[PDB]
Ligand SMILES: C[C@H]1c2ccc(O)cc2O[C@@H](c2ccc(OCCN3CCCC3)cc2)[C@@H]1c1ccc(O)cc1
C-alpha cells in the first residue's frame with residue numbers, strides 16, 4: 001500500500017528516515033582499519049532501521065529483505081560516505097572526528113580512496129541535492145540484489161523514478177534536462193557498484209575474520225515481529 | 226540528431242562470429258573456444274568503438290583508457306543480447322550454444338553463467354529493442370572508465386564525453402517516445418535500462434576475478450595492444 005504515496009510524500013518519508021551521523025570510537029594519541037571497521041559495523045545497524053522505513057521495503061518477505069541488504073550494504077555505506085564528504089574536497093569524512101585525505105589512506109586502500117574522492121567530486125560538480133541523494137540510496141537498496149516479489153520491487157523502483165523526475169521538474173529543469181540528469185545520476189550508481197566490487201576484493205585481501213554481515217545478523221537487526 | 230545517432234550505431238554493429246567447425250564438443254576445450262572467440266570479437270570491438278560518435282574525438286590515450294575499463298562489459302552485453310531469444314542458454318556463437326550445466330565443467334563458471342543468463346532473462350522481460358541495445362553498449366564504452374581518468378586536456382575530454390552521453394540519453398528518450406510510450410513510461414524505462422548497466426558492471430568485475438583465478442598468461446588486453454589496434458595509420 002506504500003505505492004499510493006505521492007512524490008512529495010515519498011521524498012518526505014525518505015528525508016525523515018535518514019540515519020544519524022556517527023563518531024569514531026577514538027580517545028581524542030593517533031590502527032586505522034580498526035576505526036573504520038568499528039564505524040562501519042555501527043553504521044550497519046542504523047542502515048537496517050533506515051531500510052525498514054523505505055516505502056515498499058517491509059512489504060517484502062524477511063528472506064528477501066535480508067538478501068537485498070546482503071547485496072547492497074557496502075554500496076549504501078559508500079554513497080553515504082561520499083555524500084557527507086561532498087563539502088570537503090580531497091578528504092573523506094568517515095566521521096566528524098575522522099576526516100582523512102588520500103595520504104592517510106596509504107595498503108591497497110589509496111586506490112579505493114581515490115575512487116570515493118572522485119565520486120564525491122562528481123556529486124560536487126553536479127550539485128547533488130539531499131532529496132536526490134535519498135532517492136539514489138533507496139534505488140541501490142532495491143536494485144542491487146534483484147538479480148510477485150520481483151514485480152513489487154520494480155513498482156517501487158518505478159515510483160522512485162517518478163519522484164526524481166518530480167523533484168527535477170520542481171527545481172525548474174526542462175524536460176530534456178530532466179531525463180539527462182536522471183541518466184547522469186543512475187550512471188553514477190554503476191560506478192558505485194564498481195567501487196563496492198573493488199572494495200569487497202580489497203576487504204577480503206585483508207584476511208579479517210569476516211567481511212560480509214551474516215544472514216542471521218541482518219535478520220536479527222531487522223527485528224521481526 | 227537522435228535519428229542520426231541511432232543510424233550510426235546500428236551501422237557500426239560488429240558481425241556475429243562463429244566457433245570453429247569439425248564434424249564432438251568437449252568440456253575440456255570449452256575455455257579454449259571461448260578465449261578464441263573473445264579475442265576475435267575484441268578486434269571488431271575496437272573498430273566498432275571508432276565508429277561510435279564522439280569517440281575518435283578523444284585522445285588515443287583516453288580511447289585506450291575507456292576500452293581497458295569497458296572491454297569485458299561490452300563483450301558480456303553483446304553476449305546477453307544474442308542470447309536473448311534463447312532461454313536458459315548462452316549463445317557464444319551460432320554453433321556454440323551452452324547451458325549452465327556445461328558451465329559446471331569449469332570451476333567458478335556457473336556463477337557467472339547464471340548472472341549472464343539472468344541478464345538475458347531481464348532483456349527478454351523488458352522486450353529490449355536493438356536500437357536500445359546499441360545505445361546501451363555505447364554508453365558503457367563512454368561511461369565505464371570516465372570515473373577513473375587532472376590535466377586541462379582531461380577536463381576537456383570528460384566534458385565532451387558527458388555531452389555525448391547526454392545525446393545518447395536524448396536518443397533513448399526519442400526512441401521510446403517514438404515507440405508510443407507516455408512521458409512517465411519513458412522516464413521509467415530509461416531508468417530501468419540504465420540500472421541494468423549497474424548489473425553488467427557487477428558481472429564484469431566478478432568475471433575479471435574469475436578469469437584471473439585461471440592463472441592464464443594474461444586476462445586483460447594490454448595498453449600497447451589496444452593502442453596498436455586503436456592507433457591505425459594512414
Ligand atoms: C567505504 C568505507 C567506510 C564507509 C563508511 C563507514 O562508516 C566506514 C567505512 O570504512 C571502510 C570499511 C571497513 C570495514 C568494513 O567491513 C568490516 C565488517 N563488517 C562489515 C559489516 C559486517 C562486518 C566495511 C567498510 C570502508 C571501506 C570499504 C572498502 C575498502 O576497500 C576500504 C574501506
Ligand SMILES: C[C@H]1c2ccc(O)cc2O[C@@H](c2ccc(OCCN3CCCC3)cc2)[C@@H]1c1ccc(O)cc1
Pocket residue numbers: 259260262263264266267300301304317334337431432433435436443444445446
Ligand atoms: C563473457 C564471456 C564471453 C563473451 C563473449 C565472447 O566472445 C566470449 C566469451 O567467453 C568468455 C571469455 C573467455 C576468455 C576471455 O579472455 C581471454 C583473454 N583475452 C581477452 C581479451 C584479450 C585476452 C574473456 C572472456 C567470457 C567469460 C568471462 C568471464 C568469465 O568469468 C567466464 C566467461
